[PDB]
Amino acid sequence: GVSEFLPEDWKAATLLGRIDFGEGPTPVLVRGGRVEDVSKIAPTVADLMNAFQPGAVIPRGEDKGPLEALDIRPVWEDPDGAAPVKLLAPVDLQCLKAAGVTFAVSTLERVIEERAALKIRTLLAERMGGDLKSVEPGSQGAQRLKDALIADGLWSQYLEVAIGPDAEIFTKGPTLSSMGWGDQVGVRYDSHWNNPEPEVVLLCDGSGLIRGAALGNDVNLRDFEGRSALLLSKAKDNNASCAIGPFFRLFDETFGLDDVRSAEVELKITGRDNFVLDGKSNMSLISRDPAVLAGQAYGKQHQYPDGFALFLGTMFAPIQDRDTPGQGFTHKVGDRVRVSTPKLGVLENEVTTCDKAKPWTFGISALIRNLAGRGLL
Amino acid sequence: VSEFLPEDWKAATLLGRIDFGEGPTPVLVRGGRVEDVSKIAPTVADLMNAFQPGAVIPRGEDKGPLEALDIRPVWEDPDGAAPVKLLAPVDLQCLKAAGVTFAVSTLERVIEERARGDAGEALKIRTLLAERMGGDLKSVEPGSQGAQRLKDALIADGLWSQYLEVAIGPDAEIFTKGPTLSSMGWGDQVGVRYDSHWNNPEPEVVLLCDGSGLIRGAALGNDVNLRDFEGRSALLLSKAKDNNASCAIGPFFRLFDETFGLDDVRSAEVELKITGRDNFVLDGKSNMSLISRDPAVLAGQAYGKQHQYPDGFALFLGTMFAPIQDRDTPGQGFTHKVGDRVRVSTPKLGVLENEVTTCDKAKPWTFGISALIRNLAGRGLL
Numbered sequence: 007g008v009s010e011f012l013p014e015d016w017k018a019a020t021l022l023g024r025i026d027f028g029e030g031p032t033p034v035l036v037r038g039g040r041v042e043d044v045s046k047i048a049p050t051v052a053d054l055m056n057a058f059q060p061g062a063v064i065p066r067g068e069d070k071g072p073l074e075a076l077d078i079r080p081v082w083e084d085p086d087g088a089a090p091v092k093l094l095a096p097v098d099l100q101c102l103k104a105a106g107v108t109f110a111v112s113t114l115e116r117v118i119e120e121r122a123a124l125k126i127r128t129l130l131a132e133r134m135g136g137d138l139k140s141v142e143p144g145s146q147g148a149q150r151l152k153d154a155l156i157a158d159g160l161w162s163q164y165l166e167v168a169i170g171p172d173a174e175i176f177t178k179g180p181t182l183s184s185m186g187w188g189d190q191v192g193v194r195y196d197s198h199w200n201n202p203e204p205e206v207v208l209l210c211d212g213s214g215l216i217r218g219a220a221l222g223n224d225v226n227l228r229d230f231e232g233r234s235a236l237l238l239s240k241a242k243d244n245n246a247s248c249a250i251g252p253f254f255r256l257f258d259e260t261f262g263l264d265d266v267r268s269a270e271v272e273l274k275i276t277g278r279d280n281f282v283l284d285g286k287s288n289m290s291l292i293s294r295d296p297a298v299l300a301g302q303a304y305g306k307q308h309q310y311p312d313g314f315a316l317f318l319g320t321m322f323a324p325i326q327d328r329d330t331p332g333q334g335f336t337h338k339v340g341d342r343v344r345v346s347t348p349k350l351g352v353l354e355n356e357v358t359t360c361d362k363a364k365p366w367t368f369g370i371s372a373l374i375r376n377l378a379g380r381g382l383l
Numbered sequence: 384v385s386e387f388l389p390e391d392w393k394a395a396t397l398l399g400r401i402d403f404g405e406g407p408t409p410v411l412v413r414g415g416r417v418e419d420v421s422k423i424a425p426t427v428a429d430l431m432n433a434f435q436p437g438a439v440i441p442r443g444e445d446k447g448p449l450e451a452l453d454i455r456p457v458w459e460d461p462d463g464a465a466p467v468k469l470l471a472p473v474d475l476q477c478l479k480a481a482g483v484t485f486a487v488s489t490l491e492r493v494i495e496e497r498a499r500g501d502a503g504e505a506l507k508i509r510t511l512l513a514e515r516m517g518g519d520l521k522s523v524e525p526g527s528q529g530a531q532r533l534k535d536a537l538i539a540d541g542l543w544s545q546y547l548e549v550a551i552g553p554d555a556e557i558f559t560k561g562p563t564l565s566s567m568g569w570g571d572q573v574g575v576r577y578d579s580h581w582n583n584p585e586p587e588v589v590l591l592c593d594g595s596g597l598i599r600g601a602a603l604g605n606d607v608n609l610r611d612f613e614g615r616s617a618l619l620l621s622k623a624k625d626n627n628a629s630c631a632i633g634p635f636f637r638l639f640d641e642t643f644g645l646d647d648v649r650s651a652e653v654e655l656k657i658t659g660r661d662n663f664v665l666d667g668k669s670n671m672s673l674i675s676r677d678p679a680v681l682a683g684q685a686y687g688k689q690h691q692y693p694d695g696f697a698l699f700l701g702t703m704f705a706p707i708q709d710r711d712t713p714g715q716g717f718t719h720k721v722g723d724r725v726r727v728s729t730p731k732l733g734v735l736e737n738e739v740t741t742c743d744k745a746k747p748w749t750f751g752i753s754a755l756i757r758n759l760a761g762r763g764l765l
């Protein structure tokens with residue numbers, strides 16, 4: 007049932023991804039509902055995006071047939087990889103970047119209620135020259151709001167990246183390490199409070215231009231980050247802690263950045279203990295425009311010659327109790343996490359611990375050897 | 384030339400990358416002579432994964448004495464007229480770094496945090512903090528039960544900080560310094576962001592590890608650092624550390640053998656020298672024995688059952704300097720100016736020397752993974 011995780015209009019869409027048909031990772035385009043092996047046009051997705059800039063026609067690759075006819079299976083139904091065809095993460099050589107704390111109104115309010123409320127929002131809004139829900143990060147209004155927050159003793163390093171001029175942008179994981187649709191993702195076995203983060207992921211080419219978008223799960227360990235923000239990397243970057251997919255949807259007549267900007271991202275978590283968590287949260291509340299976030303990651307002071315993928319952040323808060331009252335959500339082995347939006351489909355993974363997930367073994371040199379052996383270089 | 388190589392470099396085994404005119408080439412320097420080992424393995428990462436530690440690497444193609452090669456630093460060859468160019472000695476490795484592994488750095492991190500990145504507040508905060516702490520941080524082993532009891536004391540003192548958690552708690556601070564293939568090497572320009580007004584070099588020793596997590600050798604490093612970004616918010620760590628040309632490793636990795644081992648890394652005296660167009664001079668020394676966690680312990684936290692690195696990784700071990708010498712205004716401390724020359728040196732590894740400019744004036748990073756792949760393929764090396 008490969009159709010259940012594609013966008014409802016996928017046959018009218020342009021998808022860009024990676025599939026192993028049995029010889030190794032192959033960049034594919036899906037157009038008219040049919041898969042095209044484009045490896046002879048460009049041997050990687052990063053190379054394809056660099057070879058064909060926006061507005062250029064991408065030629066046809068070799069026909070692999072209707073995507074729904076490929077026997078693709080997820081790990082929880084095919085634990086041993088018996089399937090003849092394996093869908094992969096749609097990234098290969100791109101750097102994996104991630105923004106965080108991009109929904110500021112959420113952050114601000116959560117601090118005002120931790121203190122309580124209606125009375126605190128008066129002064130902050132009057133000093134800002136405006137309602138908090140209109141906060142513009144990096145503005146002069148945000149600057150006066152910062153100084154008012156400092157004067158109240160409510161300021162924090164998190165509000166700095168919420169409303170200051172610089173967004174929080176970090177490296178989510180090493181190149182070639184992402185999980186894809188239908189893979190296991192890993193939380194550290196020594197983390198006790200962790201959660202998914204349902205996100206939209208931008209595809210950017212080697213010229214810093216936004217080409218398309220996919221779904222992402224930024225697997226997150228709250229107990230590490232909460233002990234120290236200097237453990238951010240350890241909270242975000244472990245074996246199988248990144249999932250992107252199922253495909254990147256490229257911008258065309260049917261789909262553009264404006265569709266990303268108004269995308270409703272849904273999250274569902276299902277456990278064997280019969281725990282269920284559901285929730286939806288709209289990209290229109292993001293406090294920094296996706297094109298602005300791309301322009302902070304890429305510019306005169308940082309380039310990315312193979313391109314980069316960019317997680318745009320989330321406003322989902324893992325506060326729903328599971329077993330321990332007041333301590334919020336945490337994963338258990340075998341949880342199924344679905345991240346979905348209508349124009350991009352469904353990214354679904356199974357949760358295990360980083361030591362039980364398959365280790366990351368296929369790195370840059372493994373790809374090079376594989377592509378060399380197939381005559382694709 | 385010999386000015387930037389180990390004292391005993393002709394007796395050492397050095398591993399690095401040189402562009403002779405056709406693209407990046409993994410080289411070994413033995414007996415003072417350069418070997419092109421590209422036909423043995425096409426990258427440094429591949430070479431470390433093909434030969435385990437202790438295994439003798441067979442001889443490559445002789446390229447003559449190293450001192451006979453016309454290698455020139457950017458401050459003497461701005462347009463790159465030299466026929467040969469020395470590169471960073473990493474290629475496919477992930478660039479990993481440890482933080483606050485020396486007490487002098489830990490204190491300056493708490494200072495810039497409480498200053499919220501404002502250099503004009505550092506003197507006042509340093510005067511308070513340096514006396515109340517100091518003699519405290521190195522009084523415990525990080526991650527021990529003792530360290531947990533010191534944490535409870537400092538919390539009661541009102542002195543606790545998220546930086547002390549990674550300085551003495553069970554988890555070291557490890558982060559990604561920059562993207563694969565983005566490092567600068569000896570003789571390159573490094574970059575501080577043009578919008579940073581409180582910044583510094585960070586001399587460090589850099590380990591080379593293979594794809595099995597084994598420590599293989601060591602180089603020198605400059606982890607160019609923006610204090611005003613990181614002090615404003617620790618969530619800006621990546622932006623404080625990872626910008627165009629903000630990473631320098633070199634001149635070569637020295638591989639472990641009978642002339643050099645991890646024990647030499649553990650006792651290495653490291654020297655920092657900064658010189659500017661304004662005739663500012665800083666010169667200082669510190670020793671690796673002051674590190675709070677053994678280098679093998681740090682590599683063991685970076686690599687294990689919960690994070691692999693199939694192409695290997697480089698690991699900055701943490702800076703042992705935090706420059707606070709006043710440059711222009713009494714009490715205002717240090718920051719870089721364009722044209723600064725930064726020398727990191729220790730006798731067993733040589734000299735890593737770079738010229739500082741702003742990230743936007745440094746040449747952009749254009750040679751990434753695809754460029755390397757295409758270059759190697761065109762040379763028949765795959």
Ligand SMILES: CC(C)CC(=O)C(=O)O
Nearest residue numbers: 481482483484488701702
């Ligand atoms: C938090 C980091 C700035 C600390 C660091 O890089 C170091 O101490 O070497």
Ligand SMILES: [Mg+2]
Nearest residue numbers: 105106224319
């Ligand atoms: Mg995020």
Ligand SMILES: [Mg+2]
Nearest residue numbers: 585606701702
């Ligand atoms: Mg450092």
